[PDB]
Write a protein that binds this DNA or RNA. Structure first.
Ligand SMILES: NC(=O)c1ccc[n+]([C@@H]2O[C@H](COP(=O)([O-])OP(=O)(O)OC[C@H]3O[C@@H](n4cnc5c(N)ncnc54)[C@H](O)[C@@H]3O)[C@@H](O)[C@H]2O)c1
Ligand SMILES: NC(=O)c1ccc[n+]([C@@H]2O[C@H](COP(=O)([O-])OP(=O)(O)OC[C@H]3O[C@@H](n4cnc5c(N)ncnc54)[C@H](O)[C@@H]3O)[C@@H](O)[C@H]2O)c1
Ligand SMILES: Nc1ncnc2c1ncn2[C@@H]1O[C@H](CSCC[C@H](N)C(=O)O)[C@@H](O)[C@H]1O
Ligand SMILES: [Mg+2]
Ligand SMILES: [Zn+2]
Lengths: 255, 470, 343, 255, 255, 255
RNA sequence: GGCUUGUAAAUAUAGUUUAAAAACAUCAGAUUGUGAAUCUGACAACAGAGGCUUACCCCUUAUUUACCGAGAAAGCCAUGCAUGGCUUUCUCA
């Protein structure tokens, strides 16, 4: 089981991170929802219960993440799991000849800063925090799970920056897994497909229905509870390391 | 090398150092001046002051190396009071002495009355390390000088037990001291000594011979006549004409050698390796089946003599020449030799084979054991032909007496090829028919002493003997 | 004057001995006595160590003759002298490194490699892991090569130590090769002297070595027809390295010559034998035809890597042979003229 | 939960299949160890309990698999999960220039038949019975979990046939997932690394120890219970479909 | 340069193999079109010229491949390049619930025997002759290229057997490359997408035209000459080894 | 052939970019070595003749890249090929427990800025430049090639940032290929292994020997001319699009 | 193709060379910030065994090189016409 574990969930105030926090807290673990101050995460943390605490921090800022980890240590005394679910998406074609429009560098830089650079910042700071944990019977000190996208493998038109960030996460998953092997920290990556989160539910019902039809089976948008269950399974299994799991429902994104 | 024998008054030694350190290697003085000393026996009285100021410089302590060197000097110059004082020095300085320190101590201590202290010191050096032959000689000389015949004999037996070859000077001094006192047990010991000398084959010197004559004449029970004699062509004896030993061996000793070789071929691991046991037993059965053979012929030893001559040609020539003497012929063949080659001609090979039986062996097989066993089985009458010195085989022999008898057999029963020209004719080397070893017959004795001046080489033997008669 | 001087200082020595002996003395096993004995050798100046261990003292005690003890003491002294010299050299090198490091510290130039490094400096670990992977592959597909440690009976302690050292060197050379052999340690008794020494020398790596060690004889593991036992006494001269055969090397350092032991065992087991073609390719001059295990394994590796005899035999010590036969193409001319003779 | 499910486990008499059967039966599910007659699976079936049965069948034989599935339906009347864990391993270099040895074709044929052809035969036959099941509330009719190897991506020397079979399994994973998507059957593949099962008995013990030491973390051979746990996680998750999961401990096989 | 090289092309009497033979023979190389007796490859061999010969052989048969290689050696004396283009395609759903139709095992076994088993048979048999060649500057003794398909990565519905065979080829690409690395033989794989050859004429014309329209760029069926150009580029480059190249035109096949 | 084509090579003053410039210019093309002001590229441009020009520009800065492209257009009038070879390498462990040293964030940021952000900046600007080209008979307006690394797949210890950047390039390859497909611009990526460029030749002799021994075959560091030949082959082939080619000699970098 | 005893002499570096102790080397542990070009450990036996004292000899094994055929003449010496020994010449295989 996961009773007694302490998990730091980035972007845990909404979507996949929130579902993971709910599942883990229901199991019995303790959760630290690390999110932006203007995210409404305080209400969620209050709703979950005493085992859950909200940390206002920006993953792109070293000081903010350090303060969040210090708060987590003070509240619970240790960190056992870290789920990197914070990220943003921007849709923009690389270059549209008809409109004579070019992808702005600012959008690409922002997407890289949030999705990729922030994830690495959290990974390194959490590894530093978890290095203090006493190894368990199996020698494991903690687990780090990252969220990627199938865009890392099959990206669509206008997903240049998003696909770049997710592919960077996928590439860095294994080198870090080798880096932290002597420490005893497992690194895994989940590549969700399409999920019914605010990032997608905001879209008109027509495109949502079309996307639900696209998935081979089940012909529906992914349920965040499924992502939380996969995260829990990764946490429980002591042998999954340095691998990307496509939680996509067999969908291969068309151009 | 300005070396005075006068006291080394302090100031002088100052200059003794300056312009001297570099003069001699290995720190010169304290290491080399002592060696330079020991000349004329006046160097002792001055080396005393040397050591005196050496200790003065020291914090009232003397280097052990310097002490042992002083021991060597004084004992070499025979200062018994100095030996006594230095023995006290060892006692009061070190619980244990040092190798060759014990030697010098005992060499000095012989002249004192404390012989038993020498015995204790010998036992002491024994507890940890094996003492030396010189130590044994020194201590036995002291003990005999102290009239302790029983202990001297016991320590001689101890020496023999440790299996160290004794020094001839030992036994010479033994006889010299015995001169004064006559005893039946003492005479028995002397006879045992002489028998051991015969067994070990060593020859004594002129001083030893003089001791022998003095003792043997001094025996009161029987009057004896002693005289130095010549070999005289192997003539029995230059004076009094007693038959002089032999080249041939007696049948009983021949038989004991046969038994020794049998018990050796049984349970011989190295013999098995060099000569496979199956081949050994096959050869034994071969010889048993065939009758005794008068002569044994060396393998390829004759053939490879005179390299130009074809091996088969020379072998056929020699075997035919011997067969014309109508004796029984044995030849030691080799398995390789069986195969046809330029050197080996099958027609000659089969002619010699039908002429006389043969045995074949592989390369690893050693001829010497086969030849020796064949000769021993044949008996005293047979002879062997070869040129190898048999050094490898005579090695690893069990007993020194067995080695001596093996050497005697090797000299005997041998007819070395001497014809300078094979095609011209065939000739066999003559037999001297004697050796150089004490024989000690009844009512008379003869010893092959060597005159001290000549430097006899390893293969040389003394020319003049000593004879005792009546 | 001087006579009183040395008598009086000797009385002082007596007093020194008595005051030294005033202390309580306990029972001492014989070896302890020998310490003083050995110390006396040191005082004279003979080639004896400053300090010795109890086990080394015992080993000296088992020596049978005086010479053997003298040789052992000289060995120990040489070992101690070498150790001291190496320690002093290491101290000097450390001082040199310290002064050089401070000198470098003075400049503080920085701007090194543009801080542009593709790899971390973890090369030794990577080499070890690569050699491990290659050895793992060889253990499944490598060509067998057998060291039969059935010679413990014929070897003394010194020979055992030398044999173990040569085995370590040979294993290292094979491990660091492009196409490593698959090494079988055959006829290795678990509690035997060779096995004990190997375990003491390899430490924990003994269980991690990628070589097969077994008490069973080589004949029990491979077909009798595929075994060639390399011995210098064989009447058959090796011509070409064969990849379908299993070569057996006798792990035997016979400093005391015992010719034919390896050949004797091969004949007893009824196995084929071969010898290196040294005389055919080198002007031997002066030396011993029997080479060390490391040289043998290096020669075999060179041959297995398609190297010619000239390249393979380069590992034979140069001091033995003056040099290779100038061409050996004269032998080829003899071959071709004789071939014409048949035709 | 998995209580009440019926699972057909090929090669369930030993190793990973036996571990999966043990785990599933311990959770209350019913199991049908489909294995060779001489594999001694009847003893394991008796040990597991009444909920587990033994089916003597050769996956490469259509008649044998049909008989096994008929027996499973007779005993339980439903097939919900199909775990293809039956296979063999062969070590043989493609060609050995030094030894003049060429890889035998019959070895390749046998390895393909047992590993690749047998797996597809089991899939196609079991999908027939899983099609009779009434679709669940989520529309699911059953799950098929294949066993592959990391050799499908990174096969070391002397692994041509095994790597070919596992690569074929990996390749046909997604097409079959799309074929059965309309009828609500999920197809997933697991690519274990090194596990402590009799399959490794062929290799020398020292080789196995070295390979285990070469796993980044945990530095040890995989425990079959871990594979069973991953299989259960796949079964529980309704959104994992048409994917290969590398349960290898982050090990990458060098030549 | 490919002047004087000897190439053995399997299935060289049509499509990609014929295009490769045409390109190579046009630059001084020698070609041995290894194909079925009824493929009518003798006409193509006669057309190409004296530098090309026809070998009637079935890749699935060891004796036929041995005879073809012996003929090639007798005619030219060397074998520098091997190109495995022989193969067949079968379209059949794994299971059709509405029709109650199950994929036949015979079709699957035949597809694996031709596409996969035949390729490995040719590889192992030709490595023997390529081992006789003395290494050139750089140590290369020869090159082997195999024709996989994008189906090995994203296979369509009713493509289980084809995808299995091509995925097996992809998986065994690297193990064989490691096996033959000491010998000095480079092994590469090409995964063509949609190329205009007889293999497509089985598909209805409208479907083929639609698929051509779906290639991102160029929006047309691949030209066999383009595959031949890629093969020549692989041959010339002495560093491409154990890698799969997707000569697909950026298409990602949808379900 | 490539006669008349105009190529913009980023980081063309050294290593792979310089080798590509030499090969293309020698074939009659025109090159614009885009590199840093103090990289010594002016000497290389002078050495390569009148058909090669030097552009001092930092890929991370939009203004400098725009100036370089304007200079290229002024000198030659058009841009036909782009080769992104500019990049830097940084080695640093994510976290060192023994030393308590955490990976610096500025190192990660700058590695992303140079390797990933700069590549995308060049891609977008050069695509805008190529959009004005008149499509050829095949409808192609230009080609873009990127230099990824094998690290992106199996990055070793301490290659977190480098692996992240290269994986981002790999992931964004296909989305950009789909973005520019309507325009008619092919996008390809090359993943070199170990090559004898200043990035490696500066290492000690023992390290170079070990790395050469690591490659299965050919057992030597890749020659930059080989990379240039592969680039030319990609340019000539009108069908290689949206794919990553591993030009690594079958190597798989160790942990 | 000419491959097997024996006698004599000279040598013997057990990872390799040099000298009469050094360099390159070897094994184990160091997740090394790029001089690890290092740190902590392991082995250090001048063919093998006996003695000699302060530096040398006896024996054994191995390697290499020589040694052997005959006729006479010329310059002689010794032993009982024959034998033994040295120096040069050509001759026969
Ligand atoms: N939605 C999908 O189907 C899908 C698919 C593939 C991948 N993803 C990835 O899954 C993750 C979860 O997204 P989601 O679907 O839950 O949408 P979401 O918008 O609900 O999740 C994003 C969360 O990240 C937080 N966040 C953003 N920037 C942050 C920053 N700088 N510091 C701290 N917190 C920050 C937001 O406040 C929010 O809580 C994202 O990384 C997304 O890219 C989503
Ligand atoms: N060298 C290898 O073995 C290897 C292996 C795989 C991948 N790569 C990648 O291949 C590419 C080729 O580089 P290389 O190996 O020739 O090394 P290199 O350093 O010789 O080449 C890099 C070039 O990029 C230029 N450059 C660097 N930063 C720049 C910037 N901000 N703006 C403009 N130019 C800039 C440099 O001046 C240099 O000319 C690099 O991206 C490298 O990471 C190299
Ligand atoms: N010249 C040579 N020819 C063949 N093998 C040799 C050799 N020199 C050494 N060896 C091998 O190296 C091993 C150590 S040498 C020990 C030799 C010992 N006389 C014996 O009986 O073998 C030998 O056993 C043999 O296996
Ligand atoms: Mg002899
Ligand atoms: Zn008389």
């Amino acid at each position: 089981s996961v009773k007694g574990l302490v998990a730091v969930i980035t972007g845990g105030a909404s979507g996949l991170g929130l579902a993971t926090a709910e599942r883990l807290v229901g199991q019995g673990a303790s959760a630290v929802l690390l999110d932006l101050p203007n995210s409404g995460g305080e209400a969620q943390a209050k709703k979950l219960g005493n085992n859950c605490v909200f940390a206002p921090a920006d993953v792109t800022s070293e000081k903010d993440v350090q303060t969040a980890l210090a708060l987590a240590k003070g509240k619970f005394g240790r960190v056992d799991v870290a789920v990197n679910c914070a990220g943003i998406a921007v849709a923009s074609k690389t270059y549209n000849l008809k409109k004579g429009q070019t992808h702005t560098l600012e959008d690409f830089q922002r997407v890289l800063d949030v999705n990729l650079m922030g994830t690495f910042n959290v990974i390194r700071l959490v590894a530093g925090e978890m290095g203090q944990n006493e190894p368990d019977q199996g020698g494991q000190r903690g687990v780090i799970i990252n969220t990627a996208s199938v865009a890392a493998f099959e990206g669509q038109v206008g997903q240049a920056a998003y696909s770049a960030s997710k592919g960077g996460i996928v590439g860095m998953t294994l080198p870090i897994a080798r880096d932290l092997a002597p420490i005893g920290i497992r690194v895994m990556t989940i590549a969700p497909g399409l999920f019914g989160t605010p990032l997608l539910t905001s879209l008109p019902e027509k495109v949502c229905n079309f996307l639900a039809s696209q998935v081979p089976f089940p012909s529906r948008l992914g349920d965040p509870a499924e992502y939380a269950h996969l995260v829990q399974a990764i946490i429980e299994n002591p042998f999954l390391n340095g691998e990307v799991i496509r939680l996509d429902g067999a969908i291969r994104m068309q151009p | 090398i300005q070396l005075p024998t006068q006291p080394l008054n302090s100031e002088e030694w100052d200059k003794l150092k300056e312009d001297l350190k570099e003069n001699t290697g290995k720190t010169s003085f304290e290491s080399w001046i002592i060696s330079q000393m020991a000349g004329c026996h006046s160097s002792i009285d001055v080396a005393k002051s040397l050591l005196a100021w050496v200790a003065a410089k020291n914090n009232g302590i003397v280097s052990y190396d310097l002490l042992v060197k002083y021991l060597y000097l004084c004992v070499f110059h025979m200062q018994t009071s100095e030996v006594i004082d230095v023995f006290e020095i060892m006692k009061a300085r070190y619980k244990t002495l040092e190798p060759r320190g014990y030697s010098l101590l005992i060499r000095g201590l012989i002249h004192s009355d404390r012989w038993r202290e020498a015995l204790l010191l010998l036992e002491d050096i024994k507890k940890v390390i094996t003492p030396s032959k010189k130590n044994y000689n020194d201590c036995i000389q002291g003990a005999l000088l102290h009239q302790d015949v029983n202990t001297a004999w016991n320590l001689y037996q101890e020496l023999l037990g440790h299996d160290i070859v004794p020094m001839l000077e030992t036994l010479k001094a033994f006889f010299d001291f015995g001169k004064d006192i006559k005893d039946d047990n003492y005479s028995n010991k002397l006879l045992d000594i002489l028998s051991y000398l015969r067994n070990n084959q060593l020859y004594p010197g002129e001083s030893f011979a003089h001791s022998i004559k003095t003792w043997f004449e001094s025996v009161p029970g029987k009057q004896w006549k002693g005289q130095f004699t010549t070999v005289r062509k192997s003539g029995q004896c230059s004076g009094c004409g007693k038959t002089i030993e032999s080249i041939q061996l007696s049948p009983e000793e021949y038989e004991c050698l046969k038994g020794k070789i049998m018990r050796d071929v049984i349970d011989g691991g190295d013999q098995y390796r060099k000569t496979t046991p199956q081949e050994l037993k096959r050869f034994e059965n071969f010889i048993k089946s065939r009758p005794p053979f008068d002569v044994v012929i060396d393998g390829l030893n004759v053939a490879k003599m005179f390299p130009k001559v074809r091996e088969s040609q020379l072998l056929l020539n020699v075997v035919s020449q011997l067969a014309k003497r109508n004796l029984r012929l044995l030849v030691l063949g080799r398995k390789h030799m069986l195969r046809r080659s330029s050197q080996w001609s099958r027609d000659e090979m089969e002619e010699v084979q039908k002429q006389a039986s043969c045995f074949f062996a592989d390369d690893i097989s050693e001829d010497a054991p086969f030849l020796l066993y064949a000769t021993l089985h044949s008996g005293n009458h047979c002879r062997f032909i070869t040129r190898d010195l048999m050094r490898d085989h005579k090695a690893c022999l069990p007993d020194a007496k067995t080695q001596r008898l093996f050497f005697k057999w090797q000299q005997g029963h041998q007819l070395a090829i001497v014809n300078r020209f094979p095609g011209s004719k065939l000739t066999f080397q003559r037999i001297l028919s004697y050796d150089t070893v004490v024989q000690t017959t009844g009512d008379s004795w003869h010893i092959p002493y060597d005159e001290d001046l000549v430097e006899r080489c390893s293969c040389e033997v003394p020319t003049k003997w000593l004879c005792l008669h009546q | 004057l001087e006579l009183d001087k040395w008598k009086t200082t000797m009385k002082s020595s007596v007093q020194e001995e008595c005051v030294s002996t005033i202390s309580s003395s306990k029972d001492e096993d014989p070896l302890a006595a020998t310490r003083e004995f050995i110390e006396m050798w040191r005082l004279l100046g003979r080639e004896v160590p400053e300090h010795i261990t109890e086990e080394e003292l015992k080993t000296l005690m088992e020596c049978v003759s005086n010479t053997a003890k003298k040789k052992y003491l000289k060995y120990l002294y040489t070992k101690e002298k070498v150790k001291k010299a190496r320690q002093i050299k290491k101290e000097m090198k450390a001082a040199a490194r310290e002064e050089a490091k401070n000198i470098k510290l003075l400049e503080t130039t920085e701007e090194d490699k543009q801080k542009n490094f593709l790899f971390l400096r973890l090369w030794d670990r990577n080499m070890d892991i690569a050699m491990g992977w290659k050895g793992a592959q060889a253990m499944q597909f490598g060509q067998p090569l057998v060291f039969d440690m059935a010679y413990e009976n014929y070897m003394k302690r010194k020979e055992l130590q030398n044999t173990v050292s040569q085995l370590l060197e040979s294993e290292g050379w094979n491990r660091r090769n492009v196409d490593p052999f698959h090494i079988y340690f055959c006829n290795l008794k678990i509690d035997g002297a060779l096995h004990r020494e190997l375990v003491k020398r390899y430490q924990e790596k003994w269980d991690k070595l990628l070589l097969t060690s077994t008490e069973k004889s080589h004949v029990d593991l491979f077909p009798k027809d595929s075994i060639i036992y390399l011995t210098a006494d064989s009447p058959n001269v090796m011509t070409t390295f064969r990849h379908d055969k299993v070569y057996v090397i006798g792990s035997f350092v016979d400093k005391s010559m015992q010719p034919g032991t390896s050949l004797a065992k091969a004949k007893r087991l009824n196995l084929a034998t071969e010898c290196l073609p040294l005389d055919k390719y080198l002007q031997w001059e002066i030396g011993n035809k029997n080479l060390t295990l490391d040289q043998m394994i290096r020669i075999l590796l060179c041959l297995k890597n398609n190297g010619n005899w000239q390249e393979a035999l380069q590992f034979v010590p140069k001091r033995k042979h003056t040099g290779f036969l100038e061409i050996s193409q004269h032998s080829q001319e003899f071959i071709n003229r004789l071939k014409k003779a048949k035709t």
